[PDB]
Design a protein around this ligand. Structure first.
Ligand SMILES: *[C@@H]1O[C@H](CO)[C@@H](O[C@@H]2O[C@H](CO)[C@@H](O[C@@H]3O[C@H](CO)[C@@H](O)[C@H](O[C@H]4O[C@H](CO)[C@@H](O)[C@H](O)[C@@H]4O[C@H]4O[C@H](CO)[C@@H](O)[C@H](O)[C@@H]4O)[C@@H]3O)[C@H](O)[C@H]2NC(C)=O)[C@H](O)[C@H]1NC(C)=O
Ligand SMILES: *[C@@H]1O[C@H](CO)[C@@H](O[C@@H]2O[C@H](CO)[C@@H](O[C@@H]3O[C@H](CO)[C@@H](O)[C@H](O)[C@@H]3O)[C@H](O)[C@H]2NC(C)=O)[C@H](O)[C@H]1NC(C)=O
Ligand SMILES: *[C@@H]1O[C@H](CO)[C@@H](O[C@@H]2O[C@H](CO)[C@@H](O)[C@H](O)[C@H]2NC(C)=O)[C@H](O)[C@H]1NC(C)=O
Ligand SMILES: *[C@@H]1O[C@H](CO)[C@@H](O[C@@H]2O[C@H](CO)[C@@H](O)[C@H](O)[C@H]2NC(C)=O)[C@H](O)[C@H]1NC(C)=O
Ligand SMILES: *[C@@H]1O[C@H](CO)[C@@H](O[C@@H]2O[C@H](CO)[C@@H](O)[C@H](O)[C@H]2NC(C)=O)[C@H](O)[C@H]1NC(C)=O
Ligand SMILES: *[C@@H]1O[C@H](CO)[C@@H](O[C@@H]2O[C@H](CO)[C@@H](O)[C@H](O)[C@H]2NC(C)=O)[C@H](O)[C@H]1NC(C)=O
Ligand SMILES: *[C@@H]1O[C@H](CO)[C@@H](O[C@@H]2O[C@H](CO)[C@@H](O)[C@H](O)[C@H]2NC(C)=O)[C@H](O)[C@H]1NC(C)=O
Ligand SMILES: *[C@@H]1O[C@H](CO)[C@@H](O[C@@H]2O[C@H](CO)[C@@H](O)[C@H](O)[C@H]2NC(C)=O)[C@H](O)[C@H]1NC(C)=O
Ligand SMILES: *[C@@H]1O[C@H](CO)[C@@H](O[C@@H]2O[C@H](CO)[C@@H](O)[C@H](O)[C@H]2NC(C)=O)[C@H](O)[C@H]1NC(C)=O
Ligand SMILES: *[C@@H]1O[C@H](CO)[C@@H](O)[C@H](O)[C@H]1NC(C)=O
Ligand SMILES: *[C@@H]1O[C@H](CO)[C@@H](O)[C@H](O)[C@H]1NC(C)=O
Ligand SMILES: *[C@@H]1O[C@H](CO)[C@@H](O)[C@H](O)[C@H]1NC(C)=O
Ligand SMILES: *[C@@H]1O[C@H](CO)[C@@H](O)[C@H](O)[C@H]1NC(C)=O
Ligand SMILES: *[C@@H]1O[C@H](CO)[C@@H](O)[C@H](O)[C@H]1NC(C)=O
Ligand SMILES: *[C@@H]1O[C@H](CO)[C@@H](O)[C@H](O)[C@H]1NC(C)=O
Ligand SMILES: *[C@@H]1O[C@H](CO)[C@@H](O)[C@H](O)[C@H]1NC(C)=O
Ligand SMILES: *[C@@H]1O[C@H](CO)[C@@H](O)[C@H](O)[C@H]1NC(C)=O
Ligand SMILES: *[C@@H]1O[C@H](CO)[C@@H](O)[C@H](O)[C@H]1NC(C)=O
Lengths: 230, 442, 113, 119
């Protein structure tokens, strides 16, 4: 199976430059077609540039002319996208996608779309500094129990920039898990809550741990949630 | 609206048979490697990704071509040589004494006979030394040569060497050789790691029985291969992981004499051995053979079960070529007794000496009608070789047999070169295809 | 050389660019010359000489293969494709020759006036 | 099939050139050497014809137009009785006398064309 692996999140200032990498596994790199597609928060998809390593001539949209460069390292089986003169509207999630093509001779190439997508890299353009998140336990109690079901969670507060990944019991607990979208507080830092509903009889026997990871600040916190002692 | 489009150079191939020529690394040798094309210093090998091919070790058409080529070269080298027709006379023979040992009693014979002169009017009386395996008693004693009731002998030309030289088999343009790179390939079935080449590696035509010498070694483990492993009428081929050294020697200091049998025709007889007369033999290492047999038993148990008793016993019945390890060491032909190599049972510093005999009238390729005389070689003879495999056979033990018995085999030279050409196949390239597109000719 | 044998058809479309021994050598030389000349002549009679990808004027008959262009150039290999249309190769080969002869005649007619 | 239009008129047989074109290249003992010289001879004849075509500017073509005007001394028949009332086998017997003159004319004309085009 073809797989595309992208780099991690990035924080940049206005006027700087950003470089993202995308590594391909399972195909002959030179004859595959690779494209870059960005998505702004709450908006639709936008196509930035596409490129076949063997031909070597990238194609760009006119809006990003002069600021976008697409290169390839065949030995590493990687493709690089470089964006310059970043602005506030450049904050987005960037996906690396791939698709096959064929030739009928005479400079004619016909495509089929982007069939394989990467996981995406979040690039945030802002002057604020990176801050680690604070994790607090939203403990189960008599006020959080309804019909034998008790809710317990973790509040992740005061971090910058997005994103943060939150799992339960190292991914073992997925049923009933609601991870709420991050909200931008007035202080400029993000906050969210990740909660799970479990049987009330399992509170005294099952250990619940929320694992939060904020890659931009290199923060990894495993917080145990227990009913409040009385 | 689709149209036909022509593509020249597509990667398609089919199974084929063709004539392969020879390339050799850049003068009198049986296999005329001086007439072969020079070899490229760095040959090109192309790995074929995501390709699975089907190989069959036991239906390769390269083996038959190699067999025919070897036999044709052997016959071609023997045409200008001297015919020994007047040698089929009645010899008067006696036993050779004077510093023979107790093991060499009656193995050499002193035989006198009347020979034709260069004048077709008078005869001469001459004598020569013959091995006991070359003469037959007829009723001192009267003997005759072994062959003078089935074939005629031709004396091998003494300036020709029997030393094997590596040969590369090459395919013509429009053909390719697929090669299997799997390290656990058993010769038959799909090989999920394939490469393509134009030439095979150097292959030495070593003629021997019961033991493969100077060949190639396996890369991971001892390999056992057979066409149908449950059919005991099929030979089992064993490929070693590490070679076993063997030292073979003929310690007599021989002498050569020339007898003129006609105008321009000479016969090379044996004169007198100076010094004492001793037996020829080969040495193998005991510990290394024990280790190799243990590994072979361990790999053989995967076809017969965890708890079967596996025993090795010597050969049984047949001609001297088949019942002995027969080979050729620097001109002389040896037939060695391997009853100490295969004598053991396996339940779930020192040396082994194999005594050998020497024969001078040779019948090759299991043929009748063409014998060849090998002229004597002067001085002591010694050579060193690597054992790198085995040819085995199994007995048909019925009636709830919990033990299996394996015996050394051989005799057919196709199994010798099937152990080298087992990863190769020849294919034909077809670089022309048609496909539908949406474009039209202007 | 034969490096795209396991890739899709579309990916592979981008990268199309005496004595005992003495008797055996001569036959190999003759065979190579014969094969080269046969392939060149077959290309020539179709009007495709000097090209590696050549566009023809013969419509594709759906009875040869009814698959879409997505499962041909993105899902098969040339070895898989050769197994499907092997029975119809000679029909297409004759059609190409007739089509090229018609083109030659039409060019002559155009030059006539 | 092969040579099937041998009795057809010169116009009806001009549409079957590819049928005869492909049947010209592939279509030790007593029998051993009688088969190799045949292959070599076929290859040499094919190459000679191809070179003759190529040096006239007609390389890789079935019908090729030239700059040599038709000298009336060769033949005086009009086109209505050549392409509709004659056959190639009947046409060859008439103009078999003047073939080499035309061949030399074609060679010189093509060489002149190349020489003045490259200039
Ligand atoms: C497996 O491989 C090993 C290693 O490759 C092989 O062992 C080698 O065997 C060869 C052949 O026996 C041996 O080479 C001989 O060694 C001696 C010293 O060089 C010589 O006896 C001999 O040269 C004479 O014979 C040649 C053959 O014609 C002549 O070209 C040469 O001029 C010599 O002939 C002169 O001398 C002889 C006797 O002196 C005389 O009769 C002649 O008239 C003439 O005057 C060869 O070079 C190697 O030394 C061996 N190598 C090792 C390491 O032991 C082994 O044979 C292979 N096994 C099998 C089964 O094939
Ligand atoms: C054709 O052969 C190639 C080479 O063997 C195959 O490529 C391999 O594909 C597998 C997936 O099928 C890749 O595994 C994945 O790789 C990374 C790193 O481990 C990761 O995404 C996954 O955890 C997984 O392991 C493998 O890396 C890749 N190998 C190479 C060298 O690219 C290919 O799949 C074969 N094609 C088909 C159609 O089977
Ligand atoms: C083989 O026999 C011959 C005779 O047939 C032996 O040669 C003779 O040996 C005697 C005794 O030494 C000499 O007197 C003679 O001159 C020798 N020659 C002849 C022609 O008679 C020879 O020694 C014997 N060889 C062996 C190895 O036993
Ligand atoms: C390998 O040989 C064995 C015989 O040694 C074959 O097995 C026999 O098959 C026949 C029918 O063809 C049966 O009647 C016998 O009873 C079988 N013998 C045994 C001992 O089971 C076997 O089929 C051969 N394998 C192949 C692949 O042909
Ligand atoms: C094979 O080994 C034997 C036995 O070790 C060697 O023959 C001689 O053996 C005696 C004792 O039986 C020793 O005293 C000698 O030293 C051995 N001979 C030599 C020359 O050293 C024999 O030499 C060995 N074979 C080879 C080919 O070297
Ligand atoms: C076969 O003969 C070789 C030599 O041709 C022997 O190797 C020698 O062994 C002695 C005794 O251990 C060492 O001193 C030498 O250094 C070795 N020579 C080389 C070149 O390696 C070998 O031992 C013999 N093998 C057998 C089984 O007899
Ligand atoms: C296999 O080994 C057996 C047993 O060692 C050999 O049989 C011996 O043959 C000799 C004559 O060559 C007799 O004197 C012995 O009495 C036999 N032994 C037994 C136990 O019967 C047999 O020759 C060997 N087979 C070969 C070498 O092919
Ligand atoms: C191969 O070797 C074996 C074992 O040395 C030979 O068997 C011996 O044969 C002799 C007579 O040649 C008997 O006196 C011994 O008793 C036998 N030994 C055993 C252990 O049985 C066998 O004959 C040889 N093969 C031959 C010469 O073909
Ligand atoms: C026989 O086996 C020996 C021992 O493995 C081989 O000698 C090796 O040769 C390679 C290639 O030249 C060397 O790199 C190794 O160092 C050698 N090994 C030792 C232990 O010396 C030899 O090549 C084999 N083949 C022949 C024909 O003798
Ligand atoms: C050789 O011939 C002589 C006399 O011609 C005869 O006595 C003798 O038996 C013959 N054979 C020999 C010496 O083997
Ligand atoms: C030739 O003689 C040998 C030895 O006596 C004998 O075994 C063999 O059968 C004979 N061959 C023929 C064909 O008569
Ligand atoms: C060789 O391996 C194949 C599977 O690849 C198996 O079917 C076959 O029986 C094997 N042969 C032997 C002799 O083990
Ligand atoms: C063999 O005999 C010859 C001739 O007598 C002698 O020169 C040579 O040294 C001998 N070789 C030995 C004893 O190894
Ligand atoms: C070979 O191994 C077997 C099995 O362990 C053993 O019985 C025998 O003595 C060994 N031979 C040796 C070490 O020479
Ligand atoms: C035979 O015994 C070996 C010992 O290592 C074991 O690995 C193998 O599985 C056994 N074979 C069976 C149980 O079929
Ligand atoms: C086979 O091995 C047995 C047991 O060690 C031994 O008695 C016998 O002599 C051997 N046979 C040979 C070496 O021929
Ligand atoms: C091609 O023809 C062969 C031989 O008649 C037949 O077996 C095969 O099914 C045919 N294939 C197709 C796709 O028509
Ligand atoms: C043969 O001549 C007849 C009468 O002119 C004509 O109708 C027919 O087409 C010709 N056939 C061929 C095969 O040329």
């Amino acid at each position: 199976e073809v797989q595309l692996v992208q780099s991690g999140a990035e924080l940049k200032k206005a006027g700087s430059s950003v470089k993202l990498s995308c590594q391909a596994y399972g195909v002959a790199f030179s004859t595959y077609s690779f494209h870059w597609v960005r998505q702004a928060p709450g908006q639709g998809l936008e196509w930035l540039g596409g490129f076949i390593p063997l031909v070597g001539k990238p194609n760009y949209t006119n809006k990003f002319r002069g600021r976008l460069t697409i290169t390839a390292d065949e030995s590493a089986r990687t493709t690089y996208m470089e964006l310059r003169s970043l602005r506030s509207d450049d904050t987005a999630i960037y996906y690396c996608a791939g698709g096959g093509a064929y030739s009928s001779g005479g400079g004619r190439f016909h495509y089929f779309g982007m069939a394989v997508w990467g996981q995406g890299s979040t690039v945030t353009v802002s002057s604020a500094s990176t801050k680690g998140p604070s994790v607090f336990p939203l403990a189960p109690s008599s006020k959080s129990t309804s019909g034998g079901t008790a809710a317990l969670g973790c509040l992740v507060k005061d971090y910058f920039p997005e994103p943060v990944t939150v799992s339960w019991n190292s991914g073992a607990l997925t049923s009933g898990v609601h991870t709420f979208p991050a909200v931008l507080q007035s202080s400029g830092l993000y906050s969210l809550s990740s909660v799970v509903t479990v049987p009330s009889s399992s509170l005294g026997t099952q250990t619940y741990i929320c694992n939060v990871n904020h890659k931009p600040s290199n923060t990894k916190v495993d917080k145990r949630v227990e009913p409040k002692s009385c | 609206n689709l149209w036909v489009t022509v593509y020249y150079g597509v990667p398609v191939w089919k199974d084929a048979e063709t004539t392969l020529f020879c390339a050799s690394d850049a003068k009198h040798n049986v296999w005329a490697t001086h007439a072969c094309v020079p070899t490229d210093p760095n040959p090109q090998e192309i790995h074929l990704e995501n390709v699975t091919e089907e190989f069959n070790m036991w239906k390769n058409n390269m083996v038959e071509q190699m067999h025919t080529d070897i036999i044709s070269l052997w016959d071609q080298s023997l045409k200008p040589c001297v015919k020994l027709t007047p040698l089929c006379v009645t010899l008067q023979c006696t036993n050779v004494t004077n510093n023979i040992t107790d093991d060499m009693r009656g193995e050499l014979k002193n035989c006198s006979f009347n020979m034709t002169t260069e004048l077709r009017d008078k005869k001469q009386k001459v004598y020569s030394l013959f091995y006991r395996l070359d003469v037959v008693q007829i009723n001192n004693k009267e003997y005759r040569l072994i062959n003078c009731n089935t074939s005629a002998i031709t004396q091998a030309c003494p300036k020709v060497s029997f030393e094997p030289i590596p040969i590369h088999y090459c395919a013509p343009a429009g053909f390719a050789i697929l090669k299997c790179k799997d390290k656990k390939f058993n010769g038959t079935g799909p090989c999920p790691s394939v490469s393509t080449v134009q030439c095979t590696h150097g292959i030495k035509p070593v003629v021997s029985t019961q033991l493969l010498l100077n060949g190639s070694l396996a890369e991971e483990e001892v390999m056992i291969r057979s066409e149908n492993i449950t059919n005991n009428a099929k030979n089992i081929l064993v490929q070693f992981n590490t070679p076993v050294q063997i030292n073979c020697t003929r310690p007599n200091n021989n002498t050569r004499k020339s007898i003129r049998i006609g105008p321009g025709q000479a016969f090379y007889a044996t004169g007198d051995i100076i010094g004492d007369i001793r037996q020829a033999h080969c040495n193998v290492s005991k510990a290394t053979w024990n280790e190799t047999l243990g590994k072979v038993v361990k790999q053989l148990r995967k076809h017969f079960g965890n708890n079967t008793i596996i025993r090795f016993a010597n050969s049984s019945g047949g001609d001297l070529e088949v019942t002995t390890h027969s080979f050729n060491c620097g001109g002389e032909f040896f037939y060695c007794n391997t009853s100490g190599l295969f004598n053991s049972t396996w339940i779930s510093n020192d040396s082994i000496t194999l005594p050998c005999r020497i024969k001078q009238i040779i019948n090759m390729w299991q043929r009748i009608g063409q014998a060849m005389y090998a002229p004597p070689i002067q001085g002591v003879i010694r050579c060193v070789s690597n054992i790198t495999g085995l040819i085995l056979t199994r007995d048909g033990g019925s009636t709830n047999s919990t033990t299996e018995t394996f015996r050394p085999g051989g005799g057919d030279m196709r199994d010798n070169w099937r152990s080298e050409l087992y990863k190769y196949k020849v294919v034909k390239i077809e670089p022309l295809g048609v496909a539908p597109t949406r474009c039209k000719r202007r | 050389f034969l490096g795209a044998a396991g890739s899709t058809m579309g990916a592979a479309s981008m990268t199309l660019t005496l004595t005992v021994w003495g008797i055996k050598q001569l036959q190999a030389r003759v065979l190579a010359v014969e094969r080269y000349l046969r392939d060149q002549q077959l290309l020539g009679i179709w009007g495709c000489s000097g090209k590696l990808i050549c566009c023809t004027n013969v419509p594709w008959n759906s009875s040869w293969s009814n698959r879409n262009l997505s499962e041909i150039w993105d899902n098969m290999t040339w070895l898989q494709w050769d197994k499907e249309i092997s029975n119809y190769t000679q029909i297409i080969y004759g059609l190409l020759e007739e089509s090229q002869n018609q083109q030659e005649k039409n060019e002559q007619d155009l030059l006539a006036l």
